[PDB]
Write an enzyme that holds these catalytic residues in place. Structure first.
Site, PDB file in Angstrom:
ATOM      1  N   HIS A   1       4.748  -2.674   6.373  1.00  0.00           N
ATOM      2  CA  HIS A   1       3.656  -2.150   5.524  1.00  0.00           C
ATOM      3  C   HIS A   1       3.152  -3.270   4.604  1.00  0.00           C
ATOM      4  CE1 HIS A   1       5.079   1.712   7.030  1.00  0.00           C
ATOM      5  NE2 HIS A   1       6.272   1.518   6.479  1.00  0.00           N
TER       6      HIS A   1
ATOM      7  N   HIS B   1       5.403  -6.937  -4.368  1.00  0.00           N
ATOM      8  CA  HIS B   1       4.674  -7.010  -3.097  1.00  0.00           C
ATOM      9  C   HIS B   1       3.192  -6.968  -3.411  1.00  0.00           C
ATOM     10  CE1 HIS B   1       4.967  -2.760  -4.061  1.00  0.00           C
ATOM     11  NE2 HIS B   1       3.738  -2.723  -3.560  1.00  0.00           N
TER      12      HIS B   1
ATOM     13  N   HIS C   1      -0.919  -5.726  -1.840  1.00  0.00           N
ATOM     14  CA  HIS C   1      -1.809  -5.012  -0.928  1.00  0.00           C
ATOM     15  C   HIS C   1      -3.039  -5.877  -0.804  1.00  0.00           C
ATOM     16  CE1 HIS C   1       0.493  -1.257  -1.510  1.00  0.00           C
ATOM     17  NE2 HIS C   1       0.793  -1.838  -2.658  1.00  0.00           N
TER      18      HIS C   1
ATOM     19  N   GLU D   1      -5.913  -1.703  -4.629  1.00  0.00           N
ATOM     20  CA  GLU D   1      -5.683  -0.247  -4.655  1.00  0.00           C
ATOM     21  C   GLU D   1      -6.418   0.354  -5.835  1.00  0.00           C
ATOM     22  OE1 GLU D   1      -1.318   0.330  -3.822  1.00  0.00           O
ATOM     23  OE2 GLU D   1      -2.273   0.837  -1.901  1.00  0.00           O
TER      24      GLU D   1
ATOM     25  N   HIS E   1       1.930  -5.844  -7.090  1.00  0.00           N
ATOM     26  CA  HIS E   1       2.732  -4.819  -7.752  1.00  0.00           C
ATOM     27  C   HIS E   1       4.126  -5.356  -8.021  1.00  0.00           C
ATOM     28  CE1 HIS E   1      -0.015  -1.488  -5.945  1.00  0.00           C
ATOM     29  NE2 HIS E   1      -0.529  -2.091  -7.019  1.00  0.00           N
TER      30      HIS E   1
ATOM     31  N   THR F   1       2.091   4.400  -4.190  1.00  0.00           N
ATOM     32  CA  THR F   1       0.850   4.421  -3.422  1.00  0.00           C
ATOM     33  C   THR F   1       1.043   4.440  -1.915  1.00  0.00           C
ATOM     34  OG1 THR F   1       0.705   2.023  -3.439  1.00  0.00           O
ATOM     35  CG2 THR F   1      -0.357   3.229  -5.286  1.00  0.00           C
TER      36      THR F   1
HETATM   37  C1  9AA Z   1      11.202   5.322  -2.233  1.00  0.00           C
HETATM   38  O1  9AA Z   1      10.780   4.271  -3.118  1.00  0.00           O
HETATM   39  C2  9AA Z   1       9.638   3.546  -2.750  1.00  0.00           C
HETATM   40  C3  9AA Z   1       8.959   3.620  -1.578  1.00  0.00           C
HETATM   41  C4  9AA Z   1       7.791   2.880  -1.381  1.00  0.00           C
HETATM   42  C5  9AA Z   1       7.352   2.064  -2.398  1.00  0.00           C
HETATM   43  C6  9AA Z   1       6.096   1.223  -2.195  1.00  0.00           C
HETATM   44  C7  9AA Z   1       4.855   1.664  -2.862  1.00  0.00           C
HETATM   45  O2  9AA Z   1       4.481   2.988  -2.352  1.00  0.00           O
HETATM   46  N1  9AA Z   1       4.774   1.861  -4.209  1.00  0.00           N
HETATM   47  C8  9AA Z   1       4.021   0.844  -4.815  1.00  0.00           C
HETATM   48  S1  9AA Z   1       4.115   0.383  -6.408  1.00  0.00           S
HETATM   49  N2  9AA Z   1       3.244   0.240  -3.836  1.00  0.00           N
HETATM   50  C9  9AA Z   1       3.756   0.730  -2.641  1.00  0.00           C
HETATM   51  O3  9AA Z   1       3.303   0.322  -1.563  1.00  0.00           O
HETATM   52  C10 9AA Z   1       8.082   1.974  -3.589  1.00  0.00           C
HETATM   53  O4  9AA Z   1       7.541   1.133  -4.522  1.00  0.00           O
HETATM   54  C11 9AA Z   1       8.271   1.014  -5.738  1.00  0.00           C
HETATM   55  C12 9AA Z   1       9.190   2.745  -3.771  1.00  0.00           C
HETATM   56 ZN    ZN Z   2       2.252  -1.419  -4.029  1.00  0.00          ZN
END
Ligand code: 9AA
Ligand code: ZN
Ligand code: NA
Ligand code: NA
Length: 258
Positions: free
Chosen positions: A62, A92, A94, A104, A117, A196
């Site tokens: 992703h 990470h 986007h 985003e 982020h 997100t």
């Molecule tokens: C189960 O825990 C998770 C799962 C996905 C994400 C990734 C994200 O959804 N959230 C943000 S910030 N950007 C993203 O792409 C996460 O991020 C802390 C935590």
């Molecule tokens: Zn993110």
């Protein structure tokens, strides 16, 4: 779960497996700069990354995550809207297929080329998995990227991407200093929101910096050479891994600056 960013598995489909996708505090949102109000109650923001210990970089299909040692208070975020101490776990990005999309959050409907982020969890909950089950479990520092001059502190990240092209690949990524990714100003907007991507949990205090960082076209081009697919599978370039703005609903966005 086989979610992604395509026509068939993208953001418009997520609600079927994750009904919270239509919830009351989803992210990202458009930040309307004219309606965001300065909040004098906000305390000064503290980004304390001197002792950060990076470990590894992972393509998870992703995005790519730069992961940190979060077994103690080494790199933490405090202050601003936050009560207590939030430990850096990973960062990470986007990004888009073209320079005019990829962020985003949007600012007055403007989309930036990418968005960083920096993910932190509230240490009162003991571990990350417990924290994501809480409304105040996470604090995500969001930083916009625009294309212009190169960001020197990003280049170590760009240069390892060739070694993690495909989903499931990782590489050692020690001694990386995340301070080199920050803009000069820490002026920010803040609001209560969500992850997100699936599972879309409503556990985040968002802190989105006003000042973007500049990266070069060559830098962002290298992000766009990554793959969503695994090794040996048909190539699907890792681009447009962003969720669009979601309804603000019953929320106000607060500004730290007058
Ligand atoms: C189960 O825990 C998770 C799962 C996905 C994400 C990734 C994200 O959804 N959230 C943000 S910030 N950007 C993203 O792409 C996460 O991020 C802390 C935590
Ligand atoms: Zn993110
Ligand atoms: Na503040
Ligand atoms: Na809530």
């Amino acid at each position: 779960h086989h979610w992604g960013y395509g026509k068939h598995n993208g953001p418009e489909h997520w609600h079927k497996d994750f009904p919270i996708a239509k919830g009351e505090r989803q992210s990202p949102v458009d930040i309307d700069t004219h309606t965001a109000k300065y909040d004098p109650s906000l305390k000064p923001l503290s980004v304390s990354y001197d002792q950060a210990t990076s470990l590894r970089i992972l393509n998870n299909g992703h995005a790519f995550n730069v992961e940190f040692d979060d077994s103690q208070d080494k790199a933490v975020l405090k202050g601003g809207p936050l009560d207590g101490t939030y430990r850096l776990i990973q960062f990470h990005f986007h990004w888009g297929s073209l320079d005019g999309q990829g962020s985003e959050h949007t600012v007055d409907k403007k989309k930036y080329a990418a968005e960083l982020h920096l993910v932190h969890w509230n240490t009162k909950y003991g571990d990350f998995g417990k924290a994501v089950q809480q409304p105040d479990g996470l604090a995500v520092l969001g930083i916009f990227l625009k294309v212009g001059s190169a960001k020197p502190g990003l280049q170590k990240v760009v240069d390892v991407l060739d070694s993690i092209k495909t989903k499931g690949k990782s590489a050692d990524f020690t001694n990386f200093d995340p301070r080199g990714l920050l803009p000069e100003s820490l002026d920010y907007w803040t609001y209560p929101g969500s992850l997100t991507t699936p599972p879309l949990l409503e556990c985040v205090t968002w802190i989105v910096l006003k000042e973007p960082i500049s990266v070069s076209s060559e830098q962002v081009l290298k992000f766009r050479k990554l793959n969503f697919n695994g090794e040996g599978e048909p190539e699907e370039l890792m681009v447009d891994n962003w969720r669009p703005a979601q309804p603000l609903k019953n929320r106000q966005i607060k500004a730290s600056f007058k």
